[PDB]
Write a protein that holds these residues in place. Structure first.
Motif, PDB file in Angstrom:
ATOM      1  N   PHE A  11      46.692 -40.573 -68.470  1.00 40.95           N
ATOM      2  CA  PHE A  11      47.185 -40.218 -67.116  1.00 40.95           C
ATOM      3  C   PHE A  11      47.310 -41.168 -65.752  1.00 40.95           C
ATOM      4  O   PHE A  11      46.180 -42.013 -65.681  1.00 40.95           O
ATOM      5  CB  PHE A  11      46.488 -38.962 -66.039  1.00 40.95           C
ATOM      6  N   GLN A  12      47.988 -41.182 -65.004  1.00 38.98           N
ATOM      7  CA  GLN A  12      47.901 -41.904 -63.510  1.00 38.98           C
ATOM      8  C   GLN A  12      48.161 -40.900 -61.995  1.00 38.98           C
ATOM      9  O   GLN A  12      47.099 -39.776 -62.953  1.00 38.98           O
ATOM     10  CB  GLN A  12      49.679 -41.331 -63.230  1.00 38.98           C
ATOM     11  N   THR A  13      47.300 -42.095 -61.511  1.00 42.93           N
ATOM     12  CA  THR A  13      46.854 -41.478 -60.286  1.00 42.93           C
ATOM     13  C   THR A  13      47.354 -42.356 -58.918  1.00 42.93           C
ATOM     14  O   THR A  13      47.501 -42.974 -58.571  1.00 42.93           O
ATOM     15  CB  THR A  13      45.318 -41.369 -60.165  1.00 42.93           C
ATOM     16  N   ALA A  14      47.227 -41.340 -58.284  1.00 41.21           N
ATOM     17  CA  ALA A  14      47.700 -42.576 -56.949  1.00 41.21           C
ATOM     18  C   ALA A  14      47.110 -42.242 -55.170  1.00 41.21           C
ATOM     19  O   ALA A  14      47.411 -40.900 -54.834  1.00 41.21           O
ATOM     20  CB  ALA A  14      49.595 -43.122 -56.764  1.00 41.21           C
ATOM     21  N   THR A  15      46.998 -43.006 -54.788  1.00 42.27           N
ATOM     22  CA  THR A  15      46.030 -42.546 -53.315  1.00 42.27           C
ATOM     23  C   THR A  15      46.948 -42.866 -52.191  1.00 42.27           C
ATOM     24  O   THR A  15      47.599 -43.567 -52.465  1.00 42.27           O
ATOM     25  CB  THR A  15      44.454 -43.111 -53.001  1.00 42.27           C
ATOM     26  N   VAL A  16      46.826 -41.929 -51.525  1.00 40.54           N
ATOM     27  CA  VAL A  16      47.389 -42.057 -49.946  1.00 40.54           C
ATOM     28  C   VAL A  16      46.477 -42.722 -49.186  1.00 40.54           C
ATOM     29  O   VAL A  16      48.034 -41.897 -47.614  1.00 40.54           O
ATOM     30  CB  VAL A  16      48.947 -41.354 -49.650  1.00 40.54           C
ATOM     31  N   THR A  17      45.500 -42.946 -48.723  1.00 39.69           N
ATOM     32  CA  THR A  17      45.299 -43.900 -47.009  1.00 39.69           C
ATOM     33  C   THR A  17      45.971 -44.613 -46.298  1.00 39.69           C
ATOM     34  O   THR A  17      47.000 -45.168 -46.562  1.00 39.69           O
ATOM     35  CB  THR A  17      43.294 -44.676 -48.288  1.00 39.69           C
ATOM     36  N   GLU A  18      45.694 -45.146 -45.525  1.00 36.73           N
ATOM     37  CA  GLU A  18      46.585 -45.441 -44.076  1.00 36.73           C
ATOM     38  C   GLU A  18      46.678 -46.858 -44.376  1.00 36.73           C
ATOM     39  O   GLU A  18      47.775 -47.396 -44.388  1.00 36.73           O
ATOM     40  CB  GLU A  18      45.101 -45.185 -42.551  1.00 36.73           C
ATOM     41  N   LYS A  19      46.090 -47.523 -45.119  1.00 37.15           N
ATOM     42  CA  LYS A  19      46.522 -48.559 -45.855  1.00 37.15           C
ATOM     43  C   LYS A  19      47.955 -48.598 -46.277  1.00 37.15           C
ATOM     44  O   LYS A  19      49.143 -49.489 -46.505  1.00 37.15           O
ATOM     45  CB  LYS A  19      45.409 -49.254 -47.059  1.00 37.15           C
ATOM     46  N   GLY A  20      48.227 -47.994 -47.164  1.00 35.87           N
ATOM     47  CA  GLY A  20      49.089 -47.508 -47.706  1.00 35.87           C
ATOM     48  C   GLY A  20      49.260 -46.779 -49.283  1.00 35.87           C
ATOM     49  O   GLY A  20      48.339 -45.273 -49.089  1.00 35.87           O
ATOM     50  N   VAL A  21      50.585 -46.956 -50.217  1.00 39.96           N
ATOM     51  CA  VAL A  21      50.307 -46.106 -51.100  1.00 39.96           C
ATOM     52  C   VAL A  21      50.164 -46.695 -51.996  1.00 39.96           C
ATOM     53  O   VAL A  21      51.015 -47.640 -52.837  1.00 39.96           O
ATOM     54  CB  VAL A  21      51.794 -45.657 -51.117  1.00 39.96           C
ATOM     55  N   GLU A  22      48.797 -46.862 -53.317  1.00 38.85           N
ATOM     56  CA  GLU A  22      48.357 -46.973 -54.076  1.00 38.85           C
ATOM     57  C   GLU A  22      48.567 -46.754 -55.163  1.00 38.85           C
ATOM     58  O   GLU A  22      47.615 -46.048 -55.552  1.00 38.85           O
ATOM     59  CB  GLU A  22      47.395 -47.844 -54.172  1.00 38.85           C
ATOM     60  N   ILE A  23      49.743 -47.053 -56.208  1.00 40.06           N
ATOM     61  CA  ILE A  23      49.858 -46.253 -57.632  1.00 40.06           C
ATOM     62  C   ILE A  23      48.934 -47.265 -58.918  1.00 40.06           C
ATOM     63  O   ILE A  23      49.511 -48.187 -58.703  1.00 40.06           O
ATOM     64  CB  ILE A  23      51.082 -46.300 -58.370  1.00 40.06           C
ATOM     65  N   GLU A  24      48.409 -46.241 -59.452  1.00 42.25           N
ATOM     66  CA  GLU A  24      46.788 -46.616 -60.320  1.00 42.25           C
ATOM     67  C   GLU A  24      47.533 -46.101 -61.623  1.00 42.25           C
ATOM     68  O   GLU A  24      47.515 -44.745 -61.771  1.00 42.25           O
ATOM     69  CB  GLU A  24      45.476 -46.304 -59.972  1.00 42.25           C
ATOM     70  N   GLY A  25      47.463 -47.010 -62.560  1.00 37.71           N
ATOM     71  CA  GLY A  25      46.890 -46.395 -63.809  1.00 37.71           C
ATOM     72  C   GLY A  25      47.896 -47.193 -64.680  1.00 37.71           C
ATOM     73  O   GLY A  25      47.921 -48.438 -64.489  1.00 37.71           O
TER      74      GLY A  25
END
Lengths: 212, 197, 203, 241, 208, 241, 118, 244
Positions: free
Chosen positions: E183-197
């Motif tokens: 499964f995939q995950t992605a945080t949207v913190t103020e640094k940017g968008v980081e897609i992880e998986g």
């Protein structure tokens, strides 16, 4: 496919002497689950008119977003502000514009007349306004109304005088009726959001109700 | 109606079966379920028998026009996008499962799938057809990585011949065809040349 | 659907003579409202048409065909050959192939130049076909081929032709509830048209 | 005088090469009244002037309304003014209905220019004759965008397109240093002083010939008229000389 | 008729986290096993969707085109997540009223102006915001744990939020018909968008 | 050949189309602009004739963008320039909307040239008066430059100049080695060119706008950072004796 | 869905079934040339550029307005080689040929309706 | 159109002359020479060589994007001469027509049909009072499986024809006379002979020396029907082999 689904809700409106009150529970429920617990169902239109819109929550938003735009158009054109006596007819026309694809809403309008006076209107899904004094309605209706009929306008009571409704009595009655009617119904409860409006503006109010 | 494609280094292979029918009765014993769009891209077919033809004709029209307009060889991604845009827009009466593959000068070797519904995606091996659900386990358990043309051809022959016998829609000759860097070569497996199992 | 009304028409080719006959009846299902209702139209002089089927479309198709025939006759100068009306009605019926009419016309006449008898037929939506010996169409289609096949004979003089067209209808149309009570016989010999009215069972 | 055959229409090029109708419309827009368009760090005042048909009649409207965060002026033909403000209002309303954010000025002005560019090409149509001074603050400080009869809009800091105004431009350029840090009252005083130069000598600004309109940080666009404009028009020194 | 599983998400102290399964189901068979379901529309808003996949592709193309056009214009302004949510709601409602529905259900999350946003855009024209959310069949299994933890504690940090999403993936993989190990995950913190998986889920079947 | 120069659909006894030549001449009376391609990139530069100081930076610009990796340096009538920029934006948008990746420069240039030619074929719309440059960059194809004349010309240039001051610019550009240079000295060369050909008796205010796309920006169009622009400005100013 | 906001001239047409299509080959036969032209225009606009559909459609408009008045049959000799149907005879001219129209309107009414004044 | 048609005997297309000559189309014919070029196409017995002229106005302009030899189909060419802004549109129109024909009938077009379609769609522009007859010279090239190689020429008026040799440009008269003189001598040809004849005709008409890189050549042959453009090496080799 079926372009309709229920979402519950409840609208109550008391039109006193110089004050209109619109209150509504707040719970978006479809099928058997709960989507949220905030979901306010009492939107402001002008400084002296409040709209309550129950029913399916896919047109309750569209009508709210259309009425404000048409109100802005009228204000820009005629250089005035719509009174509560014209919004009823305008919304009735909009609602009847789709009589062959009816809107699934149950709207309630409350506000002040030209002079300081209470006034609460009432519609139907096809769209036909009618002036009232204490009309309620919505999903969990048919329970809210009879108690108000017993209390506000004394019916089937004898050897009892008539007293005008005081502001202190109105909230005390509305809270009691919602508390009583929240238990026996499924779609109601959670938070109660009150929008009492007078001739100085809109003051807001929120209380707990059968915490769930 | 079993259709499958496999990608290897420097080119791809492509097979099919010729048993187009009309129910419980065989319509045509031998056919060519393999259309040569342009000169490198190849397009198989499934589903119905007329919507697929119309879609293939429209794709040939538009892709030839585009290629002659840019004065460059076409890219397979353009063909995939055209098929997707044609199929999805008419997703009411255009039941036509399609699989396309081909070679291009840049990143040669591509296998694309576009099942019914207009969705488009790329995968190493594509399988599609009514009688293309009995070999999933075999193809998953046998397909390794790092194979050249000969063993890829043998693997495709075996995998298609397996479903060639355990179905009613399939049956008949086999139509292996491999598209490579240089050109296109075709051959047909008939009789005992088809591996038993 | 060709039972809301009634009708039956034949056509026999003899020796320089053609005969067309019909049945006069117009009624709403079981009920009957009139006994006289023409189903033979005099298009041209030595030519005739034999519409038979649902009447409310018979009238309309007859009117439209008469209009177009007058137009062609006036524009092109001389009379219309019998083969041309065949394609005429075929086109007129295929005009509304998807919204089909309800008519099974029969055309019978002579060539104004050669005097060679001609007979054709049509289906519901227009499918030209020509039979040399005879043809028949109508509501009671089934109970006429048997009566006509045996009684027919090639190279018949007008008298025997009239006798055969009378015998193939008078006792062959009464074997049915609808489409009875009167028979009109049109005999078209080389030089003069002649019309006769038979008598049948009043039931 | 070699221009009679090349100015009867708009789709012809002179031998030198210039559309004469555009120049004629730009000359025509100079019929009207002055309108200063000052701006500051927090507020963008828009002071205009009003003419008078007669002593008995009433004056024209020079400061219209568009939305809660934008208000345009007008100068020139009063015919196309309403026909263009209708498009203004419709676009702003559509942007508020589809999305849920106020439409930024930088896209609205581009759309207006794109619309006004069409009539200058096709036959049988004439260029518009407005002198808009669109003003309003949305998200990145107030803006002052000017529009010309030709579809060539300018960004600006302060200008007074309209009637006789070159002296107004000179005055506005002389004192174009303090407009970056001042309160509302000082900016309005500067605007009225700049407008006073346009008015001929021995003539003062009465209460019935000013239409101060202000849009800023926390207040929506409001138009001021009649005795309500008196508090702004109090100091104004005493006379230009 | 490719279908998704669940695009649940929870709010967060300065950020939002969204998870989804890289699966495609052809009714019952697992036809595809590597497709993605997370988007990066701009520098401050992300996206996730379930239901049909072709419609997700179509809205992906349309919305990416809109955002790239707006960025290309150049004014120092972008699309706040509220505007994107409103646009999706309007598009879905207009499509519904025309008898041509898009069988889709999406989640919009972002972090602009020092605050978090998360919404629901169900195809029947339903829109709202909530501290937590789930999609498809996860509305019965995924929601209760997140709701309970949020009611006990209304504000969290990154470690416990990530572990909560991990636990929810564990239970959903345990007890759903359509699911995958990865499964995939992605945080949207103020640094940017980081897609992880891709990720993985270690399980235990010791009660067998 | 006066007399036949009144509509596009009208030839001349010699054979030329006079409206097209009038449009050709009508682009001369404007500012000047140049554009050069280096080994691995391109660069442009425009002499922006600054009007009275009422305006500010970010005013009406002539360095639009059409996509993430293309841009123009149009120099002519501004309304038609904006219309053409919108058309090219729409073209690139449509191509990326369904064909994947991004439009090659040649196809977009050809499409825009054919569109701008489509008007000079009818007696209903006037021809566009504007020059047009469409320099861009690629990753594998390299750096390409194109210029589009008002009527139909879509040739590919190594480096050219458009506008009023064009002959001197061409002559001075002729004496360069723009086949083995980089993007760190062609900027200085462009600045020295724009300051070696610039009239001062009719022009008073200048503001150089520069932009490059190349390997230094890995395929993206944007304005040069202010530091490099200021350094080039100082070098060009000090180069004039 | 419009309110009233002469019935003898246009009458006897209930609102019930115009918003209810007939036999499914209705929208593919009442509007065929328009749909084919739209498809070709979309294809050309997608693959060749924005100039071709604009140019071709405005050519159509230019050539359309030189025919005879509406109350008489139009030869339509031109616009045909430009359309591309120069020799594509089909089920458009042999069935219900408009020259022999079974019903015909008034001249002034038809021309004033063609002008769009009504 | 709200501008009207200019009054005069030669000021618009739809007005006849007193003697009955279309002066506007004659001006269109005169308009080709305005640009200034020369093109010669000669067909032998198994080849269809086409030669033309290339002029570079200056040095900065690139030498790879100024060609006047486009491609219509896989095995058909063109040597468009005249105003570029109109040939650039006729080429696209011809490409679209060819694609439509291939879609509607499923085989490569014979040259005659493409020429006829172009001629008709050019003629339709000379009746309506809104058009301008775009000035070009549509010279075709290609081989056929039933009649061999063919060379066709079209004009803005719309009159097409079939030529065994054609010269188009500003020096049409003397080039045509020279080709007429040369053709009547010998009948057989070959690829090398045809190329040399075309080059010699161009050189003797222009009366100038040809640089190795000044003329491009596009040919189609029986063995290689695919339309190919001769590179610099082949043109240089043929030029240096000429007159040696």
């Amino acid at each position: 496919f079926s372009p309709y689904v229920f979402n519950g809700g409840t609208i109550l409106a008391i039109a006193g002497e110089d004050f209109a009150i619109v209150a509504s529970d707040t719970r978006l429920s479809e099928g058997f689950s709960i989507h949220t617990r905030d979901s306010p169902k009492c939107y402001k239109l002008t400084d002296k008119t409040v709209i309550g819109c129950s029913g399916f929550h896919g047109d309750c938003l569209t009508l709210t977003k259309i009425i404000e735009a048409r109100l802005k158009m009228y204000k820009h054109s005629n250089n005035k502000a719509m009174t509560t006596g014209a919004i009823a007819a305008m919304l009735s026309t909009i609602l009847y514009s789709r009589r062959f694809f009816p809107y699934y809403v149950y709207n309630i309008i409350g506000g002040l007349d030209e002079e300081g006076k209470g006034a609460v209107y009432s519609f139907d899904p096809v769209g036909s306004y009618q002036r009232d004094s204490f009309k309620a309605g919505g999903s969990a209706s048919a329970m809210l109304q009879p108690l108000l009929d017993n209390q506000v306008g004394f019916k089937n009571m004898q050897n009892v005088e008539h007293v005008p409704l005081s502001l202190d009595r109105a909230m005390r009655l509305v809270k009691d009726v919602f508390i009583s009617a929240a238990e026996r119904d499924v779609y109601t409860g959670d938070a109660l959001r009150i929008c009492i409006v007078t001739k100085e503006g809109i003051r807001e109010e929120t209380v707990s109700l059968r915490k769930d | 109606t079993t259709i499958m494609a496999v990608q290897f280094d420097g080119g791809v292979v492509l097979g099919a079966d010729s048993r187009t029918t009309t129910g419980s009765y065989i319509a045509n014993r031998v056919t060519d379920k393999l259309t040569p769009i342009h000169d490198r891209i190849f397009c198989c077919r499934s589903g119905s028998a007329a919507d697929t033809q119309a879609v293939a004709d429209a794709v040939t029209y538009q892709l030839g026009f585009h290629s002659i307009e840019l004065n460059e060889p076409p890219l397979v991604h353009t063909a995939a996008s055209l098929f997707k845009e044609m199929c999805y827009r008419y997703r009411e009466d255009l039941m036509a499962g399609i699989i396309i593959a081909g070679w291009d000068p840049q990143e040669g070797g591509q296998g694309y799938s576009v099942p019914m519904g207009g969705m488009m995606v790329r995968q190493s091996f594509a399988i599609g057809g009514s009688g293309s659900s009995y070999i999933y386990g075999y193809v998953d358990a046998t397909y390794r990585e790092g194979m050249t043309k000969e063993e890829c051809l043998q693997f495709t022959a075996n995998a298609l011949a397996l479903a060639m016998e355990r179905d009613g829609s399939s049956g008949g000759v086999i139509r292996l065809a491999a598209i490579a860097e240089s050109g296109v070569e075709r051959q047909v497996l008939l009789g005992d040349q088809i591996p038993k199992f | 659907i060709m039972s809301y009304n009634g009708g039956a028409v034949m056509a026999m080719k003899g020796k320089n003579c053609v005969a067309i006959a019909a049945d006069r009846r117009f009624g709403i299902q079981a009920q009957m409202v009139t006994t006289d209702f023409q189903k033979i139209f005099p298009m041209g002089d030595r030519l005739y048409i034999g519409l038979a089927g649902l009447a409310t479309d018979v009238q309309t198709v007859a009117q439209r065909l008469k209009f177009r025939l007058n137009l062609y006759e006036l524009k092109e100068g001389r009379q219309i050959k019998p083969y041309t009306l065949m394609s005429m009605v075929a086109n007129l019926l295929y005009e509304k192939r998807f919204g089909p009419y309800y008519t099974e016309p029969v055309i019978a006449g002579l060539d104004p130049k050669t005097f060679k008898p001609f007979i054709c037929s049509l289906d519901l939506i227009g499918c030209p076909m020509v039979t040399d010996d005879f043809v028949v169409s109508g509501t009671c289609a089934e109970q006429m081929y048997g009566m006509c096949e045996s009684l027919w004979e090639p190279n018949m003089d007008p008298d025997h032709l009239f006798e055969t067209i009378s015998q193939a209808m008078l006792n062959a149309v009464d074997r049915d509830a609808v489409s009875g009570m009167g028979v009109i016989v049109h005999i078209i010999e080389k030089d003069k048209i002649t019309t006769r009215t038979l008598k049948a069972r009043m039931d | 005088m070699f221009r009679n055959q090349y100015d009867n229409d708009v789709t012809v090029w002179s031998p030198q090469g210039r559309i004469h109708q555009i120049e004629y419309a730009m000359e025509a827009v100079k019929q009207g009244s002055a309108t200063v368009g000052l701006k500051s760090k927090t507020h963008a005042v828009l002071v205009a002037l009003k003419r008078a048909q007669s002593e008995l009649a009433a004056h024209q409207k020079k400061i219209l309304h568009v939305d809660n965060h934008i208000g345009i002026s007008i100068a020139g033909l009063t015919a196309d003014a309403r026909l263009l403000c209708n498009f203004m209002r419709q676009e702003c309303l559509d942007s508020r209905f589809v999305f849920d954010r106020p439409l930024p000025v930088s896209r609205l002005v581009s759309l207006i220019g794109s619309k006004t560019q069409i009539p200058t090409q096709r036959y049988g149509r004439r260029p518009y004759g407005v002198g808009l001074l669109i003003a309003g603050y949305d998200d990145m400080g107030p803006h002052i965008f000017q529009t010309c009869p030709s579809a060539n809009y300018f960004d600006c800091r302060a200008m007074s397109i309209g009637a006789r105004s070159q002296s107004a431009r000179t005055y506005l350029e002389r004192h174009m240093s303090e407009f970056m840090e001042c309160n509302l009252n000082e900016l309005v005083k500067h605007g009225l002083r700049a407008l006073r130069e346009t008015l001929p000598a021995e003539q003062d600004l009465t209460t019935k010939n000013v239409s101060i309109g202000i849009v800023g940080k926390d207040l929506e666009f409001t138009i001021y008229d009649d005795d309500d404009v008196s508090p702004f028009l109090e100091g104004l020194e005493e006379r230009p000389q | 008729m490719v279908t998704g599983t669940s695009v649940l998400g929870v709010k967060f102290e300065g950020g939002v986290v969204i998870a989804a399964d890289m699966l495609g189901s052809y009714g019952s068979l697992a036809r595809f096993r590597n497709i993605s379901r997370i988007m990066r529309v701009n520098n401050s808003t992300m996206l996730g969707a379930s239901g049909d996949y072709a419609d997700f592709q179509y809205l992906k193309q349309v919305l990416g085109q809109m955002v790239i056009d707006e960025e290309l214009l150049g004014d120092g302004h972008s699309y706040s997540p509220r505007a994107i949510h409103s646009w999706l709601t309007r598009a879905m409602y207009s499509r519904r009223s025309k008898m041509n529905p898009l069988w889709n259900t999406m989640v919009i999350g972002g972090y602009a102006d020092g605050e978090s946003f998360l919404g629901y855009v169900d195809m029947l024209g339903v829109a709202y915001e909530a501290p937590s959310l789930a999609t498809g069949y996860g509305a019965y299994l995924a929601q209760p744990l997140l709701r309970e933890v949020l009611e006990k504690q209304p504000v969290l940090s990154q470690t416990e939020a990530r572990d909560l999403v991990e636990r929810c993936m564990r239970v959903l993989y345990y007890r759903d018909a359509r699911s995958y190990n990865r499964f995939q995950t992605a945080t949207v913190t103020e640094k940017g968008v980081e897609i992880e998986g891709p990720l993985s889920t270690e399980t235990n079947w010791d009660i067998a | 050949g006066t007399g036949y120069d009144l509509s596009a659909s009208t030839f001349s006894p010699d054979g030329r189309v006079f409206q097209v030549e009038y449009a050709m001449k009508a682009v001369e009376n404007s500012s000047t602009a140049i554009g050069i391609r280096c080994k691995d990139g391109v660069v442009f530069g425009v002499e922006k004739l600054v009007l009275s100081k009422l305006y500010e930076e970010g005013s009406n610009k002539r360095l639009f963008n059409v996509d993430r990796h293309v841009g123009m340096a149009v120099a002519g009538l501004l309304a038609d320039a904006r219309s053409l920029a919108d058309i090219a934006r729409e073209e690139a948008s449509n191509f990326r909307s369904n064909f994947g990746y991004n439009i090659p420069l040649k196809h977009l240039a050809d499409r825009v040239a054919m569109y701008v030619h489509a008007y000079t074929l009818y007696s209903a719309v006037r021809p566009f008066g504007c020059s047009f440059m469409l320099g861009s960059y690629s990753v594998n194809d390299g750096a390409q430059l194109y210029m589009i004349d008002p009527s139909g010309v879509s040739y590919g240039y190594w480096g050219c100049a458009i506008g009023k001051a064009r002959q001197a610019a061409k002559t001075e550009i002729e004496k360069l080695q723009m086949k083995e240079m980089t993007c760190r000295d062609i900027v200085k060369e462009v600045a020295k060119i724009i300051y070696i050909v610039h009239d001062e008796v009719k022009d008073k205010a200048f503001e150089l706008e520069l932009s490059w796309v190349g390997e230094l920006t890995n395929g993206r169009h944007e304005i040069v950072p202010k530091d490099i622009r200021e350094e080039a400005e100082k070098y060009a100013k000090e180069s004039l004796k | 869905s419009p309110v009233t906001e002469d019935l003898l001239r246009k009458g006897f047409s209930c609102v019930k079934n115009e918003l209810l299509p007939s036999h499914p080959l209705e929208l593919s036969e009442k509007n065929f040339q328009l749909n084919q032209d739209k498809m070709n225009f979309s294809t050309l606009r997608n693959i060749q550029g924005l100039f071709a559909p604009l140019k071709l459609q405005m050519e159509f408009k230019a050539v359309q307005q030189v025919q005879r008045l509406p109350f008489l049959s139009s030869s339509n000799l031109s616009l045909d080689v430009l359309r591309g149907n120069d020799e594509t005879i089909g089920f458009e001219d042999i069935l219900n040929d408009p020259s022999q129209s079974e019903v015909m309107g008034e001249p002034h009414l038809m021309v004033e309706y063609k002008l769009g004044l009504l | 159109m709200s501008r009207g048609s200019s009054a005069g005997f030669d000021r618009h297309i739809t007005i006849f002359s007193p003697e009955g000559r279309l002066y506007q189309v004659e001006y269109a014919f005169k308009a080709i020479n305005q640009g200034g070029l020369t093109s010669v196409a000669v067909r032998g017995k198994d080849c269809a060589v086409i030669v033309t002229q290339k002029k570079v106005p200056d040095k900065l302009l690139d030498s790879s994007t100024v060609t006047h030899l486009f491609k219509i189909t896989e095995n058909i060419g063109c040597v468009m001469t005249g105003m570029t802004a109109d040939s650039r549109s006729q080429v696209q129109r011809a490409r679209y027509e060819a694609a439509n024909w291939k879609y509607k009938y499923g085989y490569e077009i014979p040259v005659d049909m493409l020429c006829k379609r172009i001629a008709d769609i050019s003629q339709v522009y000379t009746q309506n009072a809104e058009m301008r007859p775009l000035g070009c010279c549509m010279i075709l090239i290609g081989i056929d499986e039933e009649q061999g190689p063919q060379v066709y020429k079209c004009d803005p008026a719309g009159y097409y024809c079939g030529f065994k040799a054609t010269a188009a440009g500003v020096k049409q008269t003397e080039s045509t006379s020279f080709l007429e003189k040369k053709v009547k001598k010998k009948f057989d040809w070959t690829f090398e002979q045809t190329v040399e004849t075309a080059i010699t005709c161009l050189s003797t008409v222009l009366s100038i020396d040809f640089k190795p890189s000044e003329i491009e050549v596009g040919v189609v042959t029986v063995e290689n029907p695919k339309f190919r453009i001769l590179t610099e090496a082949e043109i240089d080799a043929h030029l240096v082999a000429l007159a040696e």
